């Protein structure tokens, strides 16, 4: 019937999470806020700016929260494996 008919298609795709990150699971605050401890004490430090820190597992906590957590424990809060910095920035 049709002049040209397609019989086989071999596509390639890329799956990604719909929400990259929506909450810092340490202070329970949102990613763009000032990490709770650095929220109440609104003076400086925000200069350093609570830029998020991405681990190897790509979990993306606040840098203040993850650094404060790393002082005693060396395990990621969620997957409970070794924590290793991989990325830093927005």
């Amino acid at each position: 019937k049709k002049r040209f008919e397609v019989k086989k298609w071999n596509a390639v795709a890329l799956w990604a999470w719909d929400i990259v990150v929506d909450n810092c699971a340490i202070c329970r605050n949102h990613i763009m806020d000032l990490c709770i401890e650095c929220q109440a004490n609104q003076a400086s430090a925000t200069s350093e700016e609570c830029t998020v820190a991405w681990g190897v597992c790509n979990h993306a906590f606040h840098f203040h929260c993850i650094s404060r957590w790393l002082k005693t424990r060396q395990v990621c809060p969620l997957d409970n494996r070794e924590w290793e910095f991989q990325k830093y920035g927005h």
Binding site: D18, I19, V20, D22, H30, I31, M32, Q39, A40, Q42, H90
Partner: protein, 271 residues
């Protein structure tokens, strides 16, 4: 019964070839059918969007004709516009990936007439249907930011803070790299309102206080931010955090202009 037009709609679909010359002929016929009194007007437009989404029409004149069809709806009275808008979205639904641009424009138009009629719940639902992430087309960042704020604002006026917070969370991922200064100001106004709605009064007070120092906004809007900051600080939870903010508000000279300043000065002096 006067339906002597619908027959040639299907007849032209099965012609020898569709070109640009025939596309312009539809304008003349459409321009007279629109200029009609009653139900006879509705039938012509209803079948126009039915016989166009068909596979028999190539997607080279169909896309151009669909956006031209939708651009003539705002001139049409909104009572009929609501009915036709729902129908075309249902007919495009089987094949959405092809018309990933016409759907967005139609839902924006439908939401605009819904909000003007004071229906916040239904207007918000329409704007959700727009695929802004799960689509093949990459939209502009300012477009996604603007749409998210509209959804959050409509949910706030619906008194549904849980849904409004979710969409303002999606909008806060694009502020840092966005370049529209007005859009950044507009986001913080909606974010502060969301925090106030969620009964996070002390956090909203900080945002309102910072927003009150913006030289971009007008003087009248600057005082409105200060008024909301004063009310939120008073309504917040007493403690070390709230007491520190109370001292900051007392230093402000503009705080004396409000009728709720006497209460502010008593709570400042531990009265």
């Amino acid at each position: 019964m006067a339906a002597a037009v619908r027959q040639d709609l299907a007849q032209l679909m099965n012609s020898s070839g569709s070109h640009k010359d025939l596309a312009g002929k539809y304008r003349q016929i459409l321009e007279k059918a629109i200029q009609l009194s009653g139900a006879e007007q509705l039938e012509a437009l209803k079948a126009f969007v039915e016989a166009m989404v068909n596979e028999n029409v190539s997607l080279v004149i169909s896309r151009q004709l669909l956006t031209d069809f939708c651009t003539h709806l705002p001139n049409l009275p909104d009572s009929t516009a609501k009915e036709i808008y729902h129908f075309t979205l249902e007919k495009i639904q089987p094949r959405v990936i092809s018309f990933e641009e016409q759907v967005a424009s139609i839902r924006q138009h439908l939401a605009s007439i819904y909000e003007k009629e004071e229906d916040w719940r239904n207007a918000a639902q329409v704007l959700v249907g727009i695929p802004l992430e799960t689509g093949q087309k990459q939209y502009n960042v300012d477009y996604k930011l603007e749409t998210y704020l509209k959804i959050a604002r409509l949910y706030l006026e619906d008194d549904d803070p849980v849904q409004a917070e979710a969409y303002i969370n999606r909008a806060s991922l694009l502020q840092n790299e966005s370049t529209n200064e007005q859009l950044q100001i507009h986001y913080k106004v909606c974010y502060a309102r969301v925090l106030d709605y969620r009964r996070k009064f002390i956090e909203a007070a900080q945002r309102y206080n910072e927003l009150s120092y913006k030289t971009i906004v007008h003087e009248s809007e600057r005082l409105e931010a200060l008024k909301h900051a004063l009310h939120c600080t008073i309504l917040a939870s007493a403690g070390q955090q709230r007491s520190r903010m109370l001292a900051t508000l007392f230093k402000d000279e503009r705080c004396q202009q409000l009728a709720a300043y006497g209460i502010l000065e008593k709570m400042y002096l531990d009265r």
